[PDB]
């Protein structure tokens, strides 16, 4: 309806940026680095303050040598190329990007509410209305991303930030990829991998819908549907694919989850003839006003405490390390396009 024209225009905007990416829009000495907000397997994100504007941002710093060592060059180029090109209410904005002799930098809006992860572990679990509010935003976000032929591949509470209005901001496009049809990389987070990833047969955007299943379950249960102490045991459970539900889950929720956590691709919601509408029109989401969610007019069920720009109280503390920059350029050719 107005979704089609919306998405069509969205694609035009995205493609222009995808075709001619922004580069080199800031420099290191334009910011004062304050505190580490979070880390991933080979990245660190710091709260910084931009000198000339006074604004705070979140600076993701990647050591080029580590990226190379881990064979993540192409992924890293994907991450930045895609992030600089997208535009959606629940995707974090990339404000600047640049590189120096040693590191790559992606400077994003600072989302001060913290990871969904920390709130979820602390509180224990989210009620179904609360989980539903967040899930709706992810459904819309994947509808947008997929329409651009993008697959996100890293949905998890750790990569979802809560903004000052209580809405979600998706972060970490490390595994995002523009692909028409099928791909094969074993990547993601173990608990969230679709079986077809694990079984190495090639996969498509449907893996995102599976992961949404895992996210909804975890939000509403307080623990993932497939957990164990080591990744290998997790994969065994996923591939078995037997799911059990908490006693408090509604019938509607369970029915939705059986259709998302569905090994059979001919049967998995999101992957059928009716596409995302099989999800939007499911009884679990009957109370959801899809347009109002997009417009951010729904009252958030939780609104984290804010305490003044630069407040980091919604984030765990991390050990700090010096940001080295060598007088010798590292991996210059590899990252030419960054």
């Amino acid at each position: 309806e107005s979704v089609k024209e919306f998405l069509a225009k969205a694609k035009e905007d995205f493609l222009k940026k995808w075709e001619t990416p922004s580069q080199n829009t800031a420099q290191l000495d334009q910011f004062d680095r304050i505190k580490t907000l979070g880390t991933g397997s080979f990245g660190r994100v710091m709260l910084v303050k931009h000198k000339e504007s006074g604004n705070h941002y979140a600076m993701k710093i990647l050591d080029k040598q580590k990226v190379v060592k881990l064979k993540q060059i192409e992924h890293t180029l994907n991450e930045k190329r895609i992030l600089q090109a997208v535009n959606f209410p629940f995707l974090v904005k990339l404000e600047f990007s640049f590189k120096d002799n040693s590191n790559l930098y992606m400077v994003m809006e600072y989302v001060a509410g913290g990871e969904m992860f920390s709130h979820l572990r602390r509180i224990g679990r989210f009620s179904e209305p609360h989980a539903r509010f967040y899930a709706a935003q992810i459904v819309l976000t994947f509808e947008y991303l997929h329409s651009l032929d993008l697959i996100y591949r890293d949905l998890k509470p750790e990569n979802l930030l809560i903004d000052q209005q209580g809405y979600i901001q998706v972060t970490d496009f490390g595994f995002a990829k523009r692909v028409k049809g099928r791909t094969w990389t074993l990547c993601g987070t173990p608990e969230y991998l679709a079986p077809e990833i694990i079984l190495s047969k090639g996969y498509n955007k449907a893996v995102d819908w599976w992961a949404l299943g895992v996210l909804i379950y975890e939000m509403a249960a307080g623990y993932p549907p497939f957990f164990a102490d080591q990744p290998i045991q997790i994969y065994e459970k996923i591939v078995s694919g037997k799911v059990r539900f908490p006693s408090h889950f509604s019938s509607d929720l369970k029915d939705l989850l059986r259709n998302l956590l569905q090994v059979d691709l001919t049967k998995r919601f999101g992957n059928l003839k009716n596409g995302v509408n099989d999800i939007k029109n499911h009884k679990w989401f009957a109370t959801t006003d899809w347009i109002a969610i997009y417009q951010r007019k729904v009252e958030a069920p939780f609104i984290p405490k804010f305490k003044g720009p630069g407040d980091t109280s919604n984030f765990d503390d991390y050990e700090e390390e010096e940001i080295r920059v060598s007088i010798n350029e590292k991996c210059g050719k590899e990252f030419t396009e960054f």
């Binding site: 890293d154 490390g174 074993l186 987070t189 993932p224 164990a228 102490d229 908490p246």
Partner: peptide, 20 residues
Amino acid sequence: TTYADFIASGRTGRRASIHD
């Protein structure tokens, strides 16, 4: 309970991505 078994497990903290 499932909750107890989760909470006693080694994977209750922030989870790292994998990328092989």
